Design an enzyme around this catalytic site. Structure first.
Site, PDB file in Angstrom:
ATOM      1  N   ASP A   1     -29.309 -25.846   3.083  1.00  0.00           N
ATOM      2  CA  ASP A   1     -29.815 -26.103   4.594  1.00  0.00           C
ATOM      3  C   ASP A   1     -29.965 -25.216   5.354  1.00  0.00           C
ATOM      4  O   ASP A   1     -28.866 -24.325   5.490  1.00  0.00           O
ATOM      5  CB  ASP A   1     -28.643 -27.297   4.865  1.00  0.00           C
ATOM      6  CG  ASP A   1     -29.081 -27.714   6.342  1.00  0.00           C
ATOM      7  OD1 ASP A   1     -30.186 -28.348   6.345  1.00  0.00           O
ATOM      8  OD2 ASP A   1     -28.098 -27.622   6.918  1.00  0.00           O
TER       9      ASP A   1
ATOM     10  N   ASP B   1     -30.414 -24.322   9.391  1.00  0.00           N
ATOM     11  CA  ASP B   1     -30.593 -24.489  10.631  1.00  0.00           C
ATOM     12  C   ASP B   1     -30.754 -23.316  11.484  1.00  0.00           C
ATOM     13  O   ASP B   1     -29.953 -23.072  12.378  1.00  0.00           O
ATOM     14  CB  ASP B   1     -29.130 -24.911  11.025  1.00  0.00           C
ATOM     15  CG  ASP B   1     -28.600 -26.272  10.235  1.00  0.00           C
ATOM     16  OD1 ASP B   1     -29.506 -26.557   9.503  1.00  0.00           O
ATOM     17  OD2 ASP B   1     -27.464 -26.790  10.232  1.00  0.00           O
TER      18      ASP B   1
ATOM     19  N   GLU C   1     -32.149 -22.218  14.506  1.00  0.00           N
ATOM     20  CA  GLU C   1     -32.554 -22.538  15.706  1.00  0.00           C
ATOM     21  C   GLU C   1     -32.560 -21.540  17.034  1.00  0.00           C
ATOM     22  O   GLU C   1     -31.475 -20.900  17.521  1.00  0.00           O
ATOM     23  CB  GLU C   1     -31.019 -23.471  16.241  1.00  0.00           C
ATOM     24  CG  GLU C   1     -30.585 -24.362  15.590  1.00  0.00           C
ATOM     25  CD  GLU C   1     -29.425 -25.186  15.918  1.00  0.00           C
ATOM     26  OE1 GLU C   1     -28.945 -25.019  17.091  1.00  0.00           O
ATOM     27  OE2 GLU C   1     -28.656 -25.709  14.802  1.00  0.00           O
TER      28      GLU C   1
ATOM     29  N   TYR D   1     -31.202 -35.305  19.222  1.00  0.00           N
ATOM     30  CA  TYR D   1     -30.249 -35.173  20.147  1.00  0.00           C
ATOM     31  C   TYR D   1     -29.927 -33.861  21.134  1.00  0.00           C
ATOM     32  O   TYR D   1     -30.992 -33.057  20.810  1.00  0.00           O
ATOM     33  CB  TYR D   1     -28.788 -35.646  19.467  1.00  0.00           C
ATOM     34  CG  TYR D   1     -28.382 -34.574  18.144  1.00  0.00           C
ATOM     35  CD1 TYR D   1     -27.947 -33.258  18.347  1.00  0.00           C
ATOM     36  CD2 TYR D   1     -28.650 -35.016  17.069  1.00  0.00           C
ATOM     37  CE1 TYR D   1     -27.724 -32.596  17.451  1.00  0.00           C
ATOM     38  CE2 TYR D   1     -28.647 -34.391  15.919  1.00  0.00           C
ATOM     39  CZ  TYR D   1     -28.195 -33.101  15.987  1.00  0.00           C
ATOM     40  OH  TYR D   1     -27.745 -32.168  15.026  1.00  0.00           O
TER      41      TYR D   1
END
Ligand SMILES: *[C@@H]1O[C@H](CO)[C@@H](O)[C@H](O)[C@H]1NC(C)=O
Ligand SMILES: *[C@@H]1O[C@H](CO)[C@@H](O)[C@H](O)[C@H]1NC(C)=O
Length: 536
Positions: free
Chosen positions: A287, A289, A291, A366
């Site tokens: 995975d 992520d 960012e 979110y």
């Protein structure tokens, strides 16, 4: 008249395919990935033919052949872990003799040597059955075992399909991982773990919590694997079909990704990931992520328009890496990612091109609004735009459509759910009893860090009447308000999580996922599988 019954001599009966130094702080000194375990026997029959033939039998299939006869020893290789029954067999012209079996443990990060995890469905968690065929994922944080008291044995595992482990750091010192300096002790921690290790290789931020800290079921002095990884091994043996993915990056750890414009570093990264997966077999893929590609992350000095292209090259090579791993392992690996729901960050990457190599897109719908601003109040994870602000573009709905507009197929999109709350304090000058038009003088009192509140707390404090509950029917998002101190908190609850479920089903999306698992009392995860149409 077969030879005499052999009597084994005591040696240690615990071996490890993958070896762990239960006293190391660096990653290179912590783990040794070996290809097989060396097993040794010593036996003895008093007065026997040393020219007799001898065999060592693990679970009654042969692993070694020789003479041994009287007073002998044998060593051999074992390539798959488990709990074995070891017997030494002697053979002459008449018949065979066997020794009383002894149990050995060949340990592997497979979990093969371990019993199933003994889990807890405490609080308001009700058991479900994954009949939906949809993704139900949740994030498990590495540091959640200290003051949070949320070990892996507390995860309501029959209510998930995927599980994300946050986080896996990338090696690098000054300039490469400056974002960690914002969090006390973290940078120094990664530097310990990455000492002697080349930069831009994956590692473990906290070796103690991951493999050394004693948790339930793994308290022994001679447990090869403990901590969170230890219990995660016990989990693949409870629910084998529960996908467990390692999350690389996150907010404070994504800094090294911006250096992957360099062919040399991106290949070293993917390489270390390949070994990382072989080293830790309970994982089911990768995975990512990052960012974020392009910038607007933690580091204000990092970002480039070219980042969107390196994102598509990283997944193409990660997929190839997993392809040629499936070849060797004979297993399937999922490649996923947690991306922003902001259209300004979605732009940077052609996800219609990246999706070819990926399975799952964890749409971080979110953190739209937060305490990082005093006068821009709003909904943190609402579905649509609020009534007073129709042209809001940071909503779950807008982002999904914007992503779909690229050409992304809807089956790969997994909408995000907030199991926590973002809030403000001293909200004033608002109109029409609508606190979101007002401004705040700071962040609300937080559970751990201020500005953030766990849903577990919010739900409790509502039932004690310490809040005013309101639900925005238009934006589909709850919030609580305290007119006295002027406290305002945004979050997701049972109601809005179901509507995120309806949305996913109606628009044929992938499912839902939540951050984070320990901030729940069971109400939001329940809403997650009721909303996705699971069975109880
Ligand atoms: C919010 O206001 C307080 C006092 O007015 C100030 O100290 C703080 O820096 C402000 N925060 C932001 C994010 O503007
Ligand atoms: C909130 O802050 C903004 C900052 O530009 C200001 O324009 C607005 O008037 C403020 N609202 C109130 C109610 O003070």
């Amino acid at each position: 008249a077969p030879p005499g019954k052999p009597s084994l001599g005591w040696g240690e009966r615990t071996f490890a395919i993958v070896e762990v130094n239960q006293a190391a702080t660096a990653y290179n000194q912590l783990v040794t990935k070996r290809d097989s375990a060396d097993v040794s026997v010593t036996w003895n029959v008093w007065s026997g033919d040393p020219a007799d033939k001898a065999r060592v039998l693990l679970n009654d299939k042969e692993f070694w052949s020789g003479t041994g006869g009287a007073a002998g020893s044998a060593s051999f290789k074992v390539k798959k872990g488990g709990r074995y029954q070891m017997v030494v067999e002697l053979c002459n012209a008449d018949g065979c003799s066997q020794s009383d079996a002894t149990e050995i443990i060949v340990a592997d990060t497979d979990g093969s040597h371990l019993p199933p995890l003994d889990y807890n469905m405490g609080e308001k968690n009700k058991p479900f059955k994954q009949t939906s065929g949809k993704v139900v994922g949740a994030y498990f944080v590495e540091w959640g075992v200290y003051p949070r008291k949320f070990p892996v044995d507390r995860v309501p595992i029959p209510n998930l399909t995927h599980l994300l482990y946050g986080f896996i750091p990338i090696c690098g010192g000054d300039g490469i991982n400056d974002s960690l300096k914002e969090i006390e002790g973290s940078f120094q921690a990664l530097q310990r773990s990455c000492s002697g290790r080349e930069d831009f290789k994956v590692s473990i931020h906290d070796p103690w919590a991951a493999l050394q800290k004693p948790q339930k079921g793994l308290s022994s002095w001679n447990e090869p694997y403990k901590g969170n990884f230890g219990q995660l091994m016990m989990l693949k043996q409870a629910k084998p079909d529960l996908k467990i993915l390692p999350s690389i990056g996150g907010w404070t750890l994504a800094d090294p990704f911006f250096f992957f414009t360099d062919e040399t570093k991106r290949r070293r990264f993917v390489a270390s990931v390949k070994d990382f997966l072989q080293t830790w077999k309970f994982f089911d893929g990768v995975d990512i992520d990052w960012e974020f590609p392009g910038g607007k992350g933690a580091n204000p000095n990092l970002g480039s328009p070219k980042d969107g292209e390196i994102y598509v090259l990283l997944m193409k090579e990660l997929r190839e890496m997993l392809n040629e791993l499936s070849a060797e392992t004979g297993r399937k690996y999922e490649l996923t990612s947690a991306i922003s729901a902001g259209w300004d960050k979605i732009q940077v990457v052609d996800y219609s091109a990246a999706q070819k190599y990926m399975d799952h897109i964890f749409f971080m719908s979110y953190d739209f609004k937060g305490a990082w601003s005093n006068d821009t109040l709003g909904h943190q994870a609402s579905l649509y735009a609020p009534d007073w602000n129709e042209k809001e573009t940071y909503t779950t709905d807008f982002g999904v459509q914007f992503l779909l507009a690229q050409g992304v197929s809807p089956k790969k999109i997994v909408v995000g759910v907030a199991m926590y709350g973002r809030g403000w304090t001293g909200v004033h000058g608002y109109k029409d009893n609508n606190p979101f038009t007002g401004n705040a003088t700071g962040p609300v009192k937080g559970t751990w860090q201020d500005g953030v509140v766990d849903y577990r707390e919010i739900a409790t404090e509502i039932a004690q009447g310490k809040w005013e509950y309101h639900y925005d029917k238009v934006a589909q998002a709850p919030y609580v308000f305290r007119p006295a101190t002027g406290d305002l908190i945004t979050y997701d609850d049972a109601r809005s999580t179901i509507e995120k479920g309806k949305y996913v089903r109606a628009n044929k999306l992938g499912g839902l996922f939540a951050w984070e698992i320990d901030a729940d009392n069971g109400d939001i995860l329940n809403a997650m599988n009721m909303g996705l149409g699971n069975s109880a």
